[model samples]
Target: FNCLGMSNRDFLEGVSGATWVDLVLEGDSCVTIMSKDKPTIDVKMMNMEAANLAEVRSYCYLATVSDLSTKAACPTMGEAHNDKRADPAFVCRQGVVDRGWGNGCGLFGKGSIDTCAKFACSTKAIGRTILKENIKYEVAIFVHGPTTVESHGNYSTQVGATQAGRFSITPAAPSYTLKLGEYGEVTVDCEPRSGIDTNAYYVMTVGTKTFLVHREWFMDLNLPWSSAGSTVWRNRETLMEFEEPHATKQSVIALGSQEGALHQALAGAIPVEFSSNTVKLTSGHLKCRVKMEKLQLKGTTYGVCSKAFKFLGTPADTGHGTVVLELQYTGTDGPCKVPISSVASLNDLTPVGRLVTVNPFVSVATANAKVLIELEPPFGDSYIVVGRGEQQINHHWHKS
Candidate 1:
């Protein structure tokens, strides 16, 4: 067995406790053949031809009393000796290396366990302090309760910023050692060697997590319209397949028209102000925004509204030229009739101010097509037009 030591045989014997060494195997049994058997030679005086056997002794039992082919050294007579480099062990039986000194403790072999005290050396303090790191999981506690406690020298592991390789844990291969206690006489085997200790209140736990950050973006919307009585205008009530860009937040639209053939056949026919900072209907489609500013050019006004609506939920394909705008406004007092006059290129004509003035109804000044309409006509707005639109809201339906 890897087990040995005095088992408290009697009041006159030794202490009762166990001792375990790194097991040495002989067949199937654990054994320890003490290094006590030495050699000898019966020779005459001053015959120095002995390869004497060396007997190693425990420091506590500092004495060896044998000369089995061995010579001995002794301390001065009647002098106290706490330490000796070479003391004879065993009063006789074990090996008399310590008792050669007049003052020595013989606690083994014939005189084993002869001395007992509160300061006795303990072999049980470290029975199994060496732990194996073969298991994959482990618990690391941060706090405990009930008994007085203090802590230090704790470390951590391979952690991450995101959830990439955070949870997987594989125990390292090298063996780990946890010292139970040290430097004290301990009789029991499984007791904490030092300070107070206790189990946690609710059994402590630890977990980890992390998240991502936010950013900003943009796009456009199409509110289509055309010339008065052109009959080719999209309606405000009906929807237009305007494949405009979208957003989750409120925004602003940039729209209006100029006097160009591209302008007449393509964009603005009315001076409809979508917002306060509204620009000329440059394109057929647009989006939304934040603040405002007044725009004045050639005795006219434009706007930039603070609030507009948009959202890019689910997108779909829409064919080119499937979306367009009509330039006209129905939001006016009793109409005089005939809305816009000239739809020509302003760059080709003499510069005239004020392209639009919305009063009794919408009136515009364009240059190209001689599609003349009265500034104030008798027709009950038949010659007047409205916004061109179809399938407008969330109109993005995959190349419709």
Candidate 2:
């Protein structure tokens, strides 16, 4: 794949920036992408009735995606030099101690990957000293070799593709014991030859909590994440921060990034009413609020769960308050998308105008604070809707 025959590189590094001119057809569109908590299962495709949009479009179904990506990393690169410069590649360097990472690329063939010396010069190891490499030790993966995040196990093609939420990923079939942070003898700062410094992300584990941090904010080189080992953290833009998405028999609440993500994951010999989708946050989408007896609207009583104006987006204004948000909208052309009607419509526009109390709140012992999430319309407030949820909280929400 050598191109120029000069720069041992394929010489085709994202050079495709000059690839397409995007004809952008005369009649293109801006599908206002409406966010709906992607369903976890595939059943009859419960049709979300956006009667509010019967005048705008129809709706259908789509699995969305594994609420797992945004919780994943977003790799964006920069210029990468072959020769080590005064600057180190990653930010986790400062936290590196003399014996912390020890002579990563063993010298004199005495330590583990002594051959590592040629890679990471002084053995200080390269990049984040934390355990994100499948270089050695017990770190085995389902990827090529060194990938973004290595599964602690060996599931051939991803320990559990269908089970990324499992806190304890069944471990490898024949698992090893080389735990994380384990430093072997392979040390040698390997350079990227002459590639671009692409942006990326990291999973910073702070004791029990972990975050899928973006490379932009956290680990931006400006101020790398510092740690004394026991406590973990990162600097990238946080897409998701959760306790963890493990598989068990308890009722759990999981939320993702991009905001307003739904959280629900429970499967066992016994579970709750159960749910697994994130919807936008609005006034009329809660439980207690919906069942309080509908509010008398245009001669009709509308409750929180009323689907009167579901899909109407910005129509809530201009005397057109029926702006529905049917996610699986089976629009005119069958299946299409839009960039969403602007967040302004989501938060700013009122279903009518001012936030009013549609349904009265039922009085409890001021304790049973278990508020369930839902989506529909009276079209009051709009939810931001983050991508998905991977973290699950067990305890019910209370009025603490």
Candidate 3:
């Protein structure tokens, strides 16, 4: 018979050395434990090397005597070896400990002395294990703007232009309070300047923060054009991103009309002819007028378009102080025709020589006219009409 791969005689001899020993056999393997009450020893072996019994001899000895610290470390085992100096040094220090040795020595060489230290060590180990477990967090950013036209334009045009001005946002003064595990908010306000259209929409952003002004109108050129009511350009969306944290200080304005298609038409139309009187004609005076035969209304489901115009100087001065025009719609319900007026001043009689034109509309011009007219929906609930048409001084009309 072989135990722990040792001959029956050798195994029996090894076990006989232990005061108390237990052996368990599992399949072709055996586990053995030896104890003398003060410490315990454990060993395992398989049935692989019994034929070379010499190789198994050392394992058997270690499995049996590993727990006998005194016997294993003492130079000699005798009852009179009472002097502490004569006590055997632990085999671990002597480099003779076996792989299967159990916990016979206490940590720091202090056998379970401090209960607090043991608790702390156990907690640290548990924390390390917990940290090793994988964990993940879900995070995202949300953006939104106003809903109505006036508010929409305020947000889109003003905020939009401000964004174009390179104005940015930064942490607010008194640094905005931020809560743990909570969202953050930031706001920026911008004003338009000369050469910058203020009526446009604007939106400000920095990193993940966004602030929008819904109105789109130019604040600089004080054009007196009136929206039928609160004009709103709805549902404008712009997306932006950043590589690092930053702040924006800026503003925006929408200068032109909300009638985009009308503006385009006016931008491309040919000038009508007109003539001037007070100013002597270096070039023959002529005048002309272009009118919008139809009106374009924004669908309740769609955003309102802006209107704009571009005109050159002409020789003819149409006596019409301000050429009032009307916008008419034929298909939709409610009123079909509405009157809209220009916001520019007509009294500034600066001579617009041959070949004159106007954007929105020209308040003052000379002869040789090209009149381009376009229409767009207003921001609010009112009519568009040209004022001061009776103030024209030196101009002749060549009605087309």
Candidate 4:
């Protein structure tokens, strides 16, 4: 988009702290150039063929900080008011000017004269003009750090004591060295006097990154106070290790837990898959078969369908909504014969609403038959009813 209120051309022009020039033609055409210093040839363009010459105009000036050397050269307050008898250096009758166009221009004017009055008036005018220009523009300069310089220093170790006893560093560690675009690391070793756990932990912070270092014991030695039967032992050496774990390129490993726990654990596991349960079908006298696949279910807020489906019976306390099931037959003959001598498996079939009464079969001799599965409703006059039917199983069947 826009480069921070500056165009791409403006950015490149300002990079070298130079002036940029642009030329515009009569036919809405323009060309620009960037220059680091003054050029040899001075170029000028003008629309000379104009009817009204008085209306024709042009302006030529350098846009830069004004040179105030002439104002500085004028006599100061102290020099103007100098008195030999009183104060050798003093100033008097400070020059001042008020607003006017050509009133101050005349021969021997009372409040203004040719040399002294005009000079004084012009000086004040020039100072005010420069101050106004300065307020309109701002200049900013950028300073960069040295790239090819080195800092000098020597490393030393110091010890300190408190209510906890004395602790010291054998030799202080060196400051980290940094490459142009790389990071550096440093390690330190510490040893403490006896009586301390020697396994203490400390936190070290560098820049915005933090690291933890655990004190490790290396060796143990006999104490100096062993003159009598009493004897004592002290840690011989201890070291602290600081490591940049991110520096090591390694892969992460994760393990799976138990069944139901793993189901919950792997709920968000990688390479995951989901599925839903099947609906059940039951009828009196005639054998009925039901199967469902690719049944589309959706959430109120629009999300992935529930992978697992569970059907529940309506409680005696509350009621609403009816459930329906579609049934289909597979044999070469019509619907399976029945006293119907066989009880279908209900495990694979998801439970729907509460089971009321098994309706009696009028007749059964159809290859593909659809039936109303279950219906439940509000306890009052209005009842919830769900209808189900089996369409001929074929490749053309699509779920919406």
Top candidate on lDDT is 3
Candidate 2: tens digits of C-alpha lDDT, residues 1-400? 0011111111011113221111110001110011111111100101111111101111111111121211111112222222222333211111111211233322222211100000111111012211212111111111111111122123442323321111111112211221111111111111112121122333222222223333333344332133333221332222122223211111112222221110111111111111112111111110000010111112012222111111312222212222212221122221111112222233344232211111111112222111111112234334422111221111111111
lDDT of 4 by residue, 219-308 (tens): 111111111222211111010111111111111111121224212322232221111111010110111010111111111122221111
lDDT of 3 by residue, 308-354 (tens): 22122232212222121212122122211111232223344332211
lDDT of candidate 1 over 1-400, digit per residue (tens): 1111112111110112212111111112111111111100000011111011111111111111112221222323232222221332211111122342233532322211111001112111000001112112211111100000011111221011110011111124211121111111111111111121111101100011110111110001222222222221222212111222111111111122222322332222222212221111111210111000111111113221111112222221112111111222223322222222221222223322111122111222321111111111122211122121231122211121
Segments of candidate 3 deviating more than 4 angstroms: 1-333, 343-400
TM-score of 3: 0.13
lDDT of 4: 0.18
Off by over 4 Å in 2: 1-168, 174-330, 345-400
Q: Please report, as a residue range, the 10-residue window in candidate 2 with the lowest summed lDDT.
A: 283-292
TM-score of 1: 0.10
C-alpha local distance difference test of each model: 0.17, 0.18, 0.19, 0.18
Query: How far off is model 3, as Cα RMSD?
Result: 44.3
